[PDB]
Structure formats: C-alpha cells, structure tokens
C-alpha cells in the first residue's frame, strides 16, 4: 500500500496550497480583465472561478488535490502571461448553448440524449 | 511573420536577456493516427513528418520495419535506395542553404539552386509518379523500379551540378559581409554538444569526428568511398563550408553509385510481404490471395520494442517502434534532429541581438513538422 505522495503529509498542506492559489486567482482577476479587453462583469467571472473550484469538491486524497493545485498554478502562469488570448478566456465561459436541461421531457423531444 | 514559431524574447536593448520558443503550433497527431492505422498507411506519415527529406525518412522507416522483420532487402533495391538517400540529402542540404541565404539576403543564388531543385523534382516525377510525397518504398524492398533511359541524364546533371555548386562557391563564400555576419554566432562547446543532444550537422561543425554512416553501415555505405568533413571552430561560416563539402561528397557517392549498379532485382523474394507483380498476381491463385489479405489485414509483425536511427541531413533521425503481434504498430515515436538542435537555443543565442537570433534559427535546418512530434 506504500505509495509516494506528491507534496503533502495530510490534507492541511493541500488546503493551504489551494486557498493560497485561489487568493492569487482572486487578486489576478482585475488586471487581466482590464488587459484582455473583455465584456463580462467581474462578479460573473469570479463566481465562475469559485464555482469551478467548487465543482471538484468531492476529492479527498491529497495527491490529486495537490495535482489540481499544480494545474491551476500552470493556468495562472499562462494567464499572468499574455500568451493566452481572448479565445481561451472566453472558452472558460460557456455561451454556445446547447440548451438541454435535466427535464425528462426536454430529453424526450430531442431524443436519444438520456 | 517575424517555418513559423512564436518567440517571447526578454531583452536588454539589442543585447538580450532570455528567449522562449513556443512551438507545437503545427501539431497534427501523427502518433495517434498511426496508433489507429496500419503500417502501410503509416508510411506517408513517415514520408512527410520531415518533408524536405522525402526519401531519407522513407529509408529509415523501411529499414526499421525490415530490421524488426528479419528480411534482407535485395541488392539492386539497396543501391537504388542509397542513390535516392544521396539525392534526398543533396536536396535537403541545398534547400537549407538557400533558405538561410534568403533569410539574411542573397536573392539570386536561392533561385539558381531552386532551378536545380526543379530538375530534381522532374527526376522524382519520372521515377515515382508523385511530385514531393513519393511513397515508392515498401518495407520489403524498393517498389516499382526506375524506368529505362534516365541514368545518362543523371550523369549530365551531375557534371552540370558540380559546375553550379562551384559557381555558388564563386558567387558567395568569401563574400565580405556574409562572412562578417557569420563568425561569432553558433559557438558550441563539445561538452555542450554532447549534453545538449545536438546531432549531425552541429556535431559536424563542432568537434567530434562522427557519422552514423561511418559508425554503422546499415547498407552499402561501407562499400562506397568518400570522406566526411568536420568543423573545428564552430563558427557558422565553417558549418556552411561543411555543408558544401557534404554536398560534394554526396556527388562523389552518386558517381560511385552510377559506376557500381548491378541489374539484379526489384523487391524481396517474399509474396507474403511484398505484393508481387501483375502476371503472378493475376494469372496465379497464391499471389492473388497474398495480395488480397496483404492489403486488407496487413502483413503480420512479430511483437517487440525496437529502435533505429539514421543520419538524416538534419542529424540523428531516430524512430522508436512498439508493436504487438499484429498488423498494427502499437506506438511509434520520432526523435527529431531539428528539435534536438532547437533544445539548446538559449545557450546558442544567449549573447547576441535579435537579427542574429534569426540567423541562428536559419543556420540550424528546420521544418517544425518534425520538430513537432
């Protein structure tokens, strides 16, 4: 069962890393949203960032949590650079619906999509 | 437009700081597609991952599969394959020379040597029937051999091409400001030549007496007679001179190949690997069956993980094959000499300005479709 982890000794260092990373994401919003010449309010993007953080909330093993910290760290590197353009920043947004809700009936009309 | 790359240069003014090549923009997923196909369909990918070396990588992939598959190719196919390796090396060196020359300046010699290369394109047409992506090479012998009435024209082309390359040395080559442009750019330590994984032409132009041909003759390269040039400075001017003498030794090998051609055979003596000729293919049952199941299923391949590498005109062209017992390759991988040469770009262009960075990118031959793997 002896498996080497990435960084941490319990989930406490993992929580430390991910909340420091989210603080960097929160302070990283206004400069880039003024620089990228965007059209979406700061509240909407910040709520989508915290909602994406809350999407992966069902993970308890600290190796995976530190790996997601490394993922978001690379993401915040490529957004503190001006490497990523308007395309990927809007690609985080989902404006191309695809309107299908979780109704059984809307799945009945547009069939074969359970 | 500053090959297409993205470059992020941190600099102090006209005397830099750092440089970051963003590459991979010409990515095509050839590894994944070969993982979903057959060998005979994977072969155009190995024709065009490097596209200037149209037949050398053909030779490398074919001899990779034949090295795996315990098949000696027939002798006349070996001589034809060495002939087109020399021809393809000549074309690749001359296009790298002309694109570096046009990247700095130098209008007309570019077009002189591209007229030469148009004669080369007509030669590829008259041999294969393609224009640039001549498949022409099966693992299991060179397929669809050359027609009659060509070799004396190749002889005339060899004389006039020796004259034109001597006239390129006349026009350029002790030009004043071209030399003054290229002396102090491209310096590579021999320890750095080893540790930074540079291959072929950089190892030629700096330091080690090395050749994959001379170390491992996998073909009739041992029997033909020549001598490789070595650089010693490295001093990109001298690397250019090494390229020119490699071209001239390739012309000598062309002369020895014209002198030493046996009229033996086209492909191997195996209709289980090579799809046989038309009279026996039609008019015979066994060849029809082997033809049919050979094109449908693909030829069976024994399992294992192999590797080979040839001396492509860019350098150590490596190919690593992984194959289950099947007619599909399990996983292929390509070691690119252009990617290897690009891997030390900080230590090359550390101490110059941006135009010299452009000249360093030019003086290492590149396609960025092989560099992409």
């Amino acid at each position: 069962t002896s498996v080497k982890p990435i960084f941490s000794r319990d989930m406490n260092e993992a929580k430390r890393r991910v909340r420091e990373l989210y603080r960097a994401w929160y302070r990283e919003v206004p400069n880039t949203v003024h620089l990228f010449q965007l059209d979406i309010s700061v509240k909407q993007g910040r709520d989508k960032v915290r909602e994406m953080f809350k999407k992966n909330a069902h993970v308890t093993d600290p190796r995976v949590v530190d790996l997601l910290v490394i993922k978001g760290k690379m993401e915040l590197e490529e957004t503190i650079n001006v490497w990523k353009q308007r395309t990927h920043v809007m690609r985080f947004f989902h404006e191309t619906e695809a309107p299908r809700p979780k109704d059984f009936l809307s799945k009945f009309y547009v069939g074969h999509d359970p | 437009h500053p090959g297409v790359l993205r470059l992020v240069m941190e600099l102090s003014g006209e005397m830099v700081r750092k440089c970051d090549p963003h590459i991979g923009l010409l990515h095509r997923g050839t590894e994944k597609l070969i993982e979903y196909k057959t060998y005979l369909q994977a072969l155009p990918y190995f024709d065009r991952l490097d596209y200037v070396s149209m037949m050398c990588n053909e030779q490398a992939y074919s001899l990779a599969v034949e090295k795996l598959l315990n098949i000696q190719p027939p002798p006349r196919a070996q001589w034809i394959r060495v002939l087109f390796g020399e021809i393809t090396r000549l074309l690749n060196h001359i296009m790298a020379v002309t694109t570096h020359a046009l990247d700095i300046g130098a209008m007309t010699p570019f077009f002189w040597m591209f007229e030469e290369r148009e004669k080369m394109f007509e030669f590829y047409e008259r041999v294969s029937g393609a224009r640039m992506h001549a498949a022409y090479v099966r693992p299991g012998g060179v397929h669809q051999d050359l027609p009659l009435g060509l070799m004396d024209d190749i002889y005339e082309f060899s004389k006039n091409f020796s004259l034109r390359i001597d006239e390129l040395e006349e026009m350029l080559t002790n030009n004043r400001i071209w030399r003054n442009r290229t002396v102090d750019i491209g310096v590579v330590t021999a320890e750095d030549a080893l540790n930074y994984g540079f291959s072929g032409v950089m190892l030629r132009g700096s330091g080690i007496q090395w050749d994959l041909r001379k170390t491992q003759p996998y073909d009739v390269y041992d029997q033909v007679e020549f001598d490789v040039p070595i650089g010693s400075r490295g001093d990109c001017y001298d690397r250019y001179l090494c390229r020119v003498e490699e071209m001239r030794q390739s012309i000598r090998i062309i002369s020895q190949c014209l002198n030493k051609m046996p009229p033996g055979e086209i492909k191997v003596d195996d209709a289980k690997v090579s799809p046989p000729k038309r009279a026996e293919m039609k008019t015979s049952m066994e060849s029809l069956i082997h033809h049919f199941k050979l094109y449908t299923e693909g030829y069976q391949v024994p399992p294992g993980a192999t590797y080979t590498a040839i001396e492509a005109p860019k350098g150590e062209f490596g190919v690593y094959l992984v194959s289950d017992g099947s007619s599909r390759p399990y996983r292929c991988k390509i070691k690119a000499p252009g990617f290897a040469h690009l891997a030390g770009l900080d230590k090359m262009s550390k101490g110059h300005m941006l135009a010299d960075v452009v000249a360093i990118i030019g003086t290492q031959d590149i396609v960025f479709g092989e560099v992409d793997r």
């Binding site: 069962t1 498996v3 080497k4 982890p5 000794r9 319990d10 992966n56 308890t60 | -």
Partner: protein
Amino acid sequence: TQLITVDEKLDITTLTGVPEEHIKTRKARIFVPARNNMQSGVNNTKKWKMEFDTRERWENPLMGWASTADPLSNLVLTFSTKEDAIAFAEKNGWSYDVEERKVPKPKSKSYGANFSWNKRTRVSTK
C-alpha cells in the same frame, strides 16, 4: 520510502478531462469477444475487450454517411484478466457492466462410436 499513503479508490476521473455528461451518461461493457463462427479461430479470445455503448449515427444529408455526435464510440481496450478491467473501470470512474467469460466445452468424440455396431450413430454415406 514508505511515505504518507492513504488507501482508497483513485481519482483520475477528474483528471482525464471528459465532462460528467459522458461520465454518467455513457456506460462501459467489458467482455471477451465472440469467436467469428464462420472461421474457427480462438486466437481472438484471451483479450478482455472494453467497449462502450453505441449511440445515434444519422445520415449526412449531402453525402449519406454515418454522421454521429459520438467521440467515444470508437474505442476498445485490451485487458488480460477481469481484475484489471474492474480496477481500470473504477479507476477512471464511469459505470461498467462485466459479462462472464464463457469458455468452450471439452467434448468427447470417437471414431469407433461413430462407426459402431448396434447404436444409432451411422452416417450411411461416407
């Protein structure tokens, strides 16, 4: 060197980048493929193939093709034992249906009882 490790399931399913629509919607099926009964080859056995369920493949209205909105309808994974299949499916998260491997039956045949004296086994022509 015998570090922190905690023992659970694995969480590669958040890492593999496929959305939860195709996680919970599509379902995997793990079986040993059939002997192609026209031929007689059991060489296509000994391979636990993992597949998915096929979905809609409508007609291309200009060309008449199999126009499908299915990225995951063209995968097959080769496994050695059923344990590897179960560990892989629980590793990457989506649901699995494992069928049981059905081997052939070693059946007794004998030329003498084919051509015996008072039994009903008599081919009468060969």
